[PDB]
Symmetry: C4
Subunit: 233 residues, 4 copies
Amino acid sequence: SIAFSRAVFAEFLATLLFVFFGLGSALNWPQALPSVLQIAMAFGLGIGTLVQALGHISGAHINPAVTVACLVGCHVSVLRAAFYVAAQLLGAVAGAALLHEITPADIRGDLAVNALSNSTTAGQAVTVELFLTLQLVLCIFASTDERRGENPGTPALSIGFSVALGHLLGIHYTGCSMNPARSLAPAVVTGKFDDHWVFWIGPLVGAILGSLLYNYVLFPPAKSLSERLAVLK
Amino acid sequence: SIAFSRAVFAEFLATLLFVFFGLGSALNWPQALPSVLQIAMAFGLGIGTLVQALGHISGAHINPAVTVACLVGCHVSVLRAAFYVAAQLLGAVAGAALLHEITPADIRGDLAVNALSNSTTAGQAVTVELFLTLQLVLCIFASTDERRGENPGTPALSIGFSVALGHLLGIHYTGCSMNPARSLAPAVVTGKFDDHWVFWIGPLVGAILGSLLYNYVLFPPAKSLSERLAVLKGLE
Amino acid sequence: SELRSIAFSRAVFAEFLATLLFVFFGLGSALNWPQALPSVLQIAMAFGLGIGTLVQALGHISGAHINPAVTVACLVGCHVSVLRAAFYVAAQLLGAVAGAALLHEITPADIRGDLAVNALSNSTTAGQAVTVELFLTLQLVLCIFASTDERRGENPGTPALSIGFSVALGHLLGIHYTGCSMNPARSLAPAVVTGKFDDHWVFWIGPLVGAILGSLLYNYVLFPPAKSLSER
Amino acid sequence: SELRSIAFSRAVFAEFLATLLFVFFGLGSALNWPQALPSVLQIAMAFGLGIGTLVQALGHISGAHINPAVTVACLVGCHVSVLRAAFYVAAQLLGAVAGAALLHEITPADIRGDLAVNALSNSTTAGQAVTVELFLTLQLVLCIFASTDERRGENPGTPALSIGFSVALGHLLGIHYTGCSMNPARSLAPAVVTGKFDDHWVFWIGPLVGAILGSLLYNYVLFPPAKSLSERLAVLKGL
Ligand SMILES: [Zn+2]
């Protein structure tokens, strides 16, 4: 019960730091405007650092889509999943509110809200988000799969570079979400809810798809005591 | 029986995601045109992520030239090699067709097709493509070698950074191929086939060269007794 | 012991040489070169790969702190004597100023400029800036503490690259506010060399409070030592 | 003898091929400036990922020095014989010139230019430049020695990435002063091909002195090997 509180607090603090660093590096700085690689790197090294710092404490999900993928995959409970999602949404909004406070009003702008970009339709955008989140979930699962042992070698860096990879494509379409908490945080703070469902449906469907594809298509477990049913039939 | 189907599906899905992410990061030019480092990084982190995610399930070739190189020192049969190459070509075209569908019409353009750049001749270009794939094949062979030292595990980041390295040079000459499936995918979707043989001959010759150089010249592997007999009995 | 004695001298010398090289490379890459002005990613990468290279090269010799704020975090956290902490902080401040003085004498006079001093940027107030510096150093210590946690013995992990990328991460945000410090020695070094002490306390209070916060958060809240025989 | 063994021939060939590929990729990414001029980070990354890839591919075969300064650092630090050191240096210089000559052949005449030769930049004096080159090669050699240190536990690939990022780090500073050498073979290769030898001694004295300094500092001052079989047990009793 104490260990669970430490895990929920870690999930809160991780999303707080991720959103604070992520959005802050993505803001329109007039003296030196951030590049697609620079932003991809900020979110990428953000996740990679927090997985390194907090992975052994909570699993370092830092994303409700990842927690949901984990609910379908990891032997996690619906109780832990709810407490994690709630901690991530609270941590994210706290990170976006904290950043607002420390950033001068002139720069703040859209506070790096997820917005449909380059005349992309919501239907085209929801499809990108699905694939952006699918590849992250595939990588996260492979990097943390206990059956693999110490073989992944670089889980934090791999997971981090997967977030960066998502951003190198995603930025052009939606500003890149892959995370419902990262989307809700600046949307709640700076009132902007433009096609918000895309940043929820996309990541969540992509995460569930990736979780089902990994755990039951690509690398499923061996047959359980359900084989006794096939013997009885 | 199931394991082989899972491996072929992984090879298909890996090339689908690689081509989708790779090309998509190389086109997308509004009031933010992608840089050589940005593109190198997209293809590089693309392969690295996919080797990490799918290596343990298929070997994560994601390249017909890599599968061909592996036909000499990866314990890949001609049957598996054919099924992998077919899965990669199908996955790649599916990734390029999917990207076309999701990208607004005006941005699409060439769809990041491999094309001769900065007035480079096809002969000069095919030589670049040979060396770009030779170093990649050299890195994959060492990275998957039990004798390379370290602890068990595949360095997915090392392989990824080899792809990025290839792009830092290759972009200027051909838009960097190193992968015949990555070349065919936007060529089939768009209809552009200008100097298409360079993107097949270059990676394939470079891969076979790197495979022969590693396995016969540089670090000849330890033969099992059955393999050794395939050589001995397969003489006089 | 004699063996134990040489080891401490090697550690203090490594901390000196590490801060010398870090400040020399870091500031030098951040200078306003006219032919090619450095980008936020380029600078983040210079300081990032700087710490990562030094952690790789010197970690097994001193712990590769290269920062008085992290040295202070090991005092409250990874419980070390006040003697080593003082010798490390003194070595880092000496190494840093030596690195900044060496760089000054290596760069032509025209391009030296402000010598990459930490300065309040984009009209950020000192109070807003000290809050940024707190959070930049907090994430760094959290990452350092986990990468070097005694309990993380077995699998080596990637401490040098991870720590390196955590410094780069802090720069991708921090550059816009203060030019990014996260390190009181990196701030003092060009300030002593080129007399520019504008809002200097921010670059001391920010990193130090952030480091102590991260050390207390890791050792008392997040991952404390086991209180009893329950799990030891 | 060492000379008449297959393994030694493979190591010398590996050192030749590594310098060939390094110089070919490195210079080519630094000179290619038509309607897309390369940035300091882009070039740093090309040379950086170049060394990292080659250390990964060839490290287990020859030690992947790809640099006469590194070979010299290893000579001073008792890792290689004077015979192997000579054969490595000769292979690196031959490989480098072959890599620059090959690149010249494949690059259109309009973009070749000075072929990314090391040249004193931003009005830096040769004395200031030789001091930079010393510190660039010193940190590199410090990283190489730790990355190939049997006493240090690491995960697969990470030592080659660390050496690679050390080369990039050097370039992020060095580019502004000399175009960043850290390697006498990388300097000689386009100088022989293009015919430009302006302040060439800096690119030899700088890296060689920096490498010897780093080798002596690591092996004698910072982290020397054990002297006795009882040394590690003598440390253990301090609990
Ligand atoms: Zn050596």
